[PDB]
Design a protein around this ligand. Structure first.
Ligand SMILES: Nc1ncnc2c1ncn2[C@@H]1O[C@H](COP(=O)(O)OP(=O)(O)OP(O)(O)=S)[C@@H](O)[C@H]1O
Ligand SMILES: Nc1ncnc2c1ncn2[C@@H]1O[C@H](COP(=O)(O)OP(=O)(O)OP(O)(O)=S)[C@@H](O)[C@H]1O
Ligand SMILES: [Mg+2]
Ligand SMILES: [Mg+2]
Lengths: 333, 300
């Protein structure tokens, strides 16, 4: 009897809010299909498994950070290339002023359709991000280095002058504005960031990132990338052994890691991952340094085994399809 | 009307730490901490525990980062959990007041006070200065809500993010966003921190968490709570039922070996909590003992 005017006051309050601030201001979370988690590929199968939901989330903020020459730019060009192949539009804000367009083409990016900007200030860089996000016409934005987003007062001033907290304040104001717009247009924003040392530290890690604490909070995924070794063809160094740690995840369980090769000119070695995952799931048998598929001996060593999968497109498609079926938590098709 | 009503936090260790046995209804609560401390997980645990008692709940996601699948995994009934995603900071607080006035919802949660951007700052440019507009907007909202919340008997939980003060020599350099109005009006104030990992040998499957009560108008403040948040599954209330059982000398622990009523239960905490899962009888009767010994005022 008394629990019914409860439901009436609810429906009346819902009617009041939904006509004041527009149609879908309040809903029920189980019914809201704008709140579901769509993803896009990173260009690494191992990293797609480590992220749990099978890729990077659309409508969210992502941070990639690491030491120098660890593969941060290369990893973000591989996600742009994969999204372009699925008929999406992409932008690249190059605050570092260090993008080589010929290398981007070799990694598989469509250079003629990628929107590029080299802004003079951090305010200009974050105002272009907002304008592209609100447009609804751009799916993936990459900002290359938070560390190079310098406020206008610091550009106008002299070297030595103190502007303490100014960059951190600029970033804190930008996150507030962007987070809403990005979700509304279903646009993925990737911030690359550099590492700095904190002085006078006995306890914990001395490593930190630039641009303050706001980005750590607003980010849905945070990735730590590191170069853990060289890839050699005799004495020639031909690429880099790479490890990625998922330090923060809001769409799945964190603290999983991914290992892969970056080969200079080609980018991420896809078939190299396909072997290592095939070996792990008992689809490829390893007899010391002899790889074999269904008894049929494919090669001697990982490089020859990878070279074999390259000249057998049908056999590689078969193994990919199974590894995908097995290790993907919730395959959506 | 001024007699206090409480609802469970989901964690038993935190229910003892507050003293009254939960968060007070018709009041304002603040829950701050660093990155990935378990602020959202704790407030979805409250909503879950509340809507199991036949209550309606709302979630105002200003952060734009709520996963409905994870909410269901923690035990939130998402089919009748009200969710809003406001564009401005003013919309978020007008929806909070409109829901409070109606007298229909019992619990409201505003995720990130840091993300409540004033209208003027949104249609402005990045670089433009709006000194204290967030603090005024919050100060206006608090004096308008405090009265409307009490007569409705509606709980409002604000989640806050930590920022750092520049050129401070004294005290702690940590701050909270959205002014010092919320600091005054807030009845309870929790400070969550991740203090370690929970492993399956090497595989990291959880977070060792510590909650501190820095303010309490309802009971004695400056008490602690320690517990485990597992990634999916949610809060580990069996893991607490052992830790409080051994603290009151109902359970015994001899190194890595557990024993209750003479007969041993398992080796380590993971096997000890796994046996409590398989024995609802002892898990019922130990809950009985821990509650009736450490309850401040038994309602009925
Ligand atoms: N244009 C190129 N031609 C050949 N190799 C390249 C080229 N650009 C980058 N690489 C290599 O690819 C590996 C990863 O480079 P990046 O992706 O540029 O890493 P990064 O972390 O962005 O480094 P920064 O911005 O310079 S600190 C490095 O060993 C580079 O030398
Ligand atoms: N959907 C999910 N699936 C699995 N684990 C999760 C999920 N969401 C969060 N977690 C983890 O649970 C722990 C607590 O997360 P939260 O409750 O979101 O904490 P938080 O302080 O709200 O973090 P923020 O909002 O990003 S500053 C973290 O270690 C997360 O990685
Ligand atoms: Mg680079
Ligand atoms: Mg949160």
């Amino acid at each position: 009897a008394i629990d019914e005017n409860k439901q009436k006051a609810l429906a009346a309050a819902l009617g009041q809010i939904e006509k004041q601030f527009g149609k879908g201001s309040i809903m029920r979370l189980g019914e809201d299909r704008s709140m579901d988690v769509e993803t896009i590929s990173t260009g690494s199968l191992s990293l797609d498994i480590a992220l749990g939901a099978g890729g990077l989330p659309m409508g969210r903020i992502v941070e990639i950070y690491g030491p120098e020459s660890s593969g941060k730019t290369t990893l973000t060009l591989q996600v742009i290339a994969a999204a372009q192949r699925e008929g999406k539009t992409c932008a690249f804000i190059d605050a570092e002023h260090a993008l080589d367009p010929i290398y981007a083409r070799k990694l598989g990016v469509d250079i003629d359709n990628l929107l590029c900007s080299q802004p003079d200030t951090g305010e200009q860089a974050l105002e272009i991000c907002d304008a592209l996000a609100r447009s609804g016409a751009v799916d993936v934005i990459v900002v290359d280095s938070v560390a190079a987003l310098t406020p206008k007062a610091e550009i106008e001033g002299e070297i030595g002058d103190s502007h303490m907290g100014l960059a951190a304040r600029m970033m804190s104001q930008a996150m507030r504005k962007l987070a809403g717009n990005l979700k509304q247009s279903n646009t993925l924003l990737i911030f690359i960031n550099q590492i700095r040392m904190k002085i006078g530290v006995m306890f914990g890690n001395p490593e930190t990132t630039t641009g303050g604490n706001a980005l750590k909070f607003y980010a849905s995924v945070r990735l730590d990338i590191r170069r853990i070794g060289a890839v050699k063809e005799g004495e020639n160094v031909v690429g880099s052994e790479t490890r990625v740690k998922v330090v923060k995840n809001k769409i799945a369980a964190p603290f999983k890691q991914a290992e892969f090769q970056i080969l200079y000119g080609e980018g991420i070695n896809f078939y190299g991952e396909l072997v290592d995952l095939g070996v792990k799931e008992k689809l490829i048998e390893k007899a010391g340094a002899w790889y074999s598929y269904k008894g049929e001996k494919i090669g001697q060593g990982k490089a020859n085994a990878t070279a074999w999968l390259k000249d057998n497109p049908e056999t590689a498609k078969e193994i990919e399809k199974k590894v995908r079926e097995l290790l993907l938590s919730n395959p959506n098709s």
